[PDB]
């Protein structure tokens, strides 16, 4: 395991993650390059702050479900390559209706460079601690639509509120949100900005 | 970690599992009791034989995707409790159309006792090594229908053949198949028959 990085599962004890990119259940239809393990990897500092966010279980009984943490540069390249492929309509309906695969790298859904490769960015949700179900956010992970924006409309009051709560828990835990994606958070004072890693998640 | 058991991912190196029960993506709609960490746990002997089955990568370029290995008794109880709950139609369409939740524990889909609790049973599939996609099996994991039977009809020649290949790889690796579920395999000479464990998957 790379230095300054750890498997977050051993730090965030009772977490029920699902490494989306380590399974065929993502927008590309199959595990992205560099993902040979269904585990979330991350920087010790990310784990530390995630622990603080998860301890905000004090909020409205929420649990966190992690989807993606550190993402290898090659995974980002894999995304870019995928965006450049002809439309097979395999994941369109679920991940990007309303947008075309042509404009993926212009509307800015799949950039050439990801904060994830720095190891301090995380994708997550919150599940009800009391009921166990997933807190409704109005759009799915990797929705790639204006619907996924924090400030989005067309989302119910509960869904918008829910996003606000996720954000609040993250911001109060050392993270910075991102307006275009309610699920995206980056550690505010990350250990390796400028550093885009490429070791595999395994 | 319990004795004679290990995290399979540490033995089965480049495996791309997806602990279905450790995520809301199962028939109950949420992580079953005992499923905390998104990892496949199993007996050393199960790992040993899974390694042999995975080395049958020699077959038609197949990779294995693990869904479930050791399953705590409490997870089995959780399934039973779920089967006894009123129908909310939340997962019906995907996991059990054609069957009713009333007859779940009679048609034998959710028994009071699972070979999984012995730690040598495994649920898996094979993905094409060459292309990367999932090998089509005709029915989804936990389909709970006659369609899920190894000898089932209503499944294409390729799909039936595919199941046969999974089975063959497993049988040649020390496993015994189960006719009612193409994904179910049990180690033939398992270390703890008669032993139904209840430590959590974490």
From Swiss-Prot, chains A, B:
Induction: By vancomycin, mediated by VanS/VanR. Optimum pH is 7-9. Pfam families: Peptidase_M15. Keywords: Antibiotic resistance, Cell wall biogenesis/degradation, Dipeptidase, Hydrolase, Metal-binding, Metalloprotease, Plasmid, Protease, Zinc. The keyword Protease applies. This is D-alanyl-D-alanine dipeptidase. Inhibited by aminoalkyl phosphinate analogs. NCBIfam families: dipept_VanX (NF033115). It comes from Enterococcus faecium.
């Amino acid at each position: 395991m790379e230095i300054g990085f750890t498997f977050l599962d051993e730090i965030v004890h009772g977490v029920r993650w699902d490494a989306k990119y380590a399974t065929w259940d993502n927008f590309t239809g199959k595990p992205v390059d560099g993902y040979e393990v269904n585990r979330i990897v991350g920087t010790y500092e990310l784990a530390e702050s995630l622990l603080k966010a998860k301890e905000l279980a004090a909020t409205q009984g929420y649990g966190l479900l992690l989807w993606d943490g550190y993402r290898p540069k090659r995974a980002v390249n894999c995304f870019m390559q995928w965006a450049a492929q002809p439309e097979n309509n395999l994941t369109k309906e679920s991940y990007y209706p309303n947008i075309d695969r042509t404009e993926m790298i212009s509307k800015g859904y799949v950039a050439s460079k990801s904060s994830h490769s720095r190891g301090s960015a995380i994708d997550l949700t919150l599940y009800r601690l009391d009921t166990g179900e997933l807190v409704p956010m109005g759009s799915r992970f990797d929705f790639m639509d204006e619907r996924s924006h924090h400030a989005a409309n067309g989302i119910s009051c509960n869904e918008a509120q829910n996003r606000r709560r996720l954000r609040s828990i993250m911001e109060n835990s050392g993270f910075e949100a991102y307006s275009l994606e309610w699920w995206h958070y980056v550690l505010r004072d990350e250990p390796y900005p400028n550093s885009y890693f490429d070791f595999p998640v395994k």
